[PDB]
Amino acid sequence: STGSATTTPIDSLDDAYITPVQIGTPAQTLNLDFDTGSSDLWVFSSETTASEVXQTIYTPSKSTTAKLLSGATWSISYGDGSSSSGDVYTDTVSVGGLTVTGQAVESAKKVSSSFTEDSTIDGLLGLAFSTLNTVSPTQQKTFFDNAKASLDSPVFTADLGYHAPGTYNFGFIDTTAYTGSITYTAVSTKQGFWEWTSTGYAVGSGTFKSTSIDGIADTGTTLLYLPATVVSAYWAQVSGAKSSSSVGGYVFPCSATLPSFTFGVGSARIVIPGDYIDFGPISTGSSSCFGGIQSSAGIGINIFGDVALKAAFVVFNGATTPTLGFASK
Ligand SMILES: CSC[C@H](NC(=O)[C@H](Cc1ccccc1)NC(=O)N1CCOCC1)C(=O)N[C@@H](CC1CCCCC1)[C@@H](O)C(=O)OC(C)C
Secondary structure, eight states: OOEEEEEESSSSSOOOOEEEEETTTTTEEEEEETTTTTOOEOOOOOOOOGGGGGSOOGGGGOTTEEEEEEEEEEEEOOTOOOOEEEEEEEEEETTTEEEEEEEEEEEEEEEEEHHHHHHOOEEEESSSOOOGOOOBBBBBOOHHHTTTTSSSSSSEEEEEESSSSSSEEEEEOOSSSSSOOEEEEEEETTTOOOEEEEEEEEESSOOOOOOOOEEEEETOOOOOEEEEHHHHHHHHSSOOEEEEETTTTEEEETOOOOOOEEETTTEEEEEEEEEGGGGEEETOOOOOEEEEESSTTSSEEEEEEEHHHHHHEEEEEEEOEEEEEEEEE
């Protein structure tokens, strides 16, 4: 089997991407953020504290296939400090025509304020390794892990758009979705992430510096977070750019033409167009824009978030030894 679903930016800034997911019988369609940086499929629900719901909710008592996972609970917090918790059902979950039975669907009893405040995100579908799942006492498998037995190939691909719809595919590689060839690179699962080592970078038309950058491919992070020295090298080529303590990162004049940023995948190179590194105005009508490449020093992990990933066709190869592939597009 395979599945193919359209993923859409939630807003004009490409802050996040949502993908429809059908849960239960009859299907309840929720728009979830597919997050390769976590491993829980959780949803706003009929159990969620009413004052914390503003979203489409899952109602397990309306699904004939929902089963309570007795005694199971979950609690998660994310890199941006958001959080949620609740209890656990198993149910039928379909993405893009690919159906998994017995998927753990974590039903939120409570969600943090940023979840309430974001009308467009009805929950998360985690696609990191199942060792990060937060269900206790027994961790639950991701949708991808449960699908692998039936998939035509144990892979999923992310094809995120720049201010445009894109695609998540499960079980196959669409050879018409990218140019050149895919280059694969090794993945370490020691921290549960799609963690890999970039071979280096270049700014604009300058030289490629071979410097190992250990980081994660995270569809659930908006920006590209890289080492401070790398980020400084990038913004040094933008004459108006400066770090702003009050705004919380590099800011620059919206009228600037930004250089591209190239990162290495083995011998291959992925080029992020300059425009992709313009995240957008700090407020509507501002002359100042926030940078799409920021220092990872405060997070402690380098993160190839959506600014990077949307410049590529990205293959998440979930064979027993996983690998990560990148192609230009
Ligand atoms: C240091 S990593 C910070 C990352 N969050 C983000 O990148 C959020 C995503 C978002 C945008 C709009 C609305 C809601 C959420 N954006 C954000 O913090 N931004 C601040 C900088 O300007 C750009 C937007 C994050 O926590 N990612 C989560 C998934 C994310 C899904 C959406 C809801 C909130 C949680 C996950 O990938 C994670 O924890 O990754 C860690 C392991 C790096």
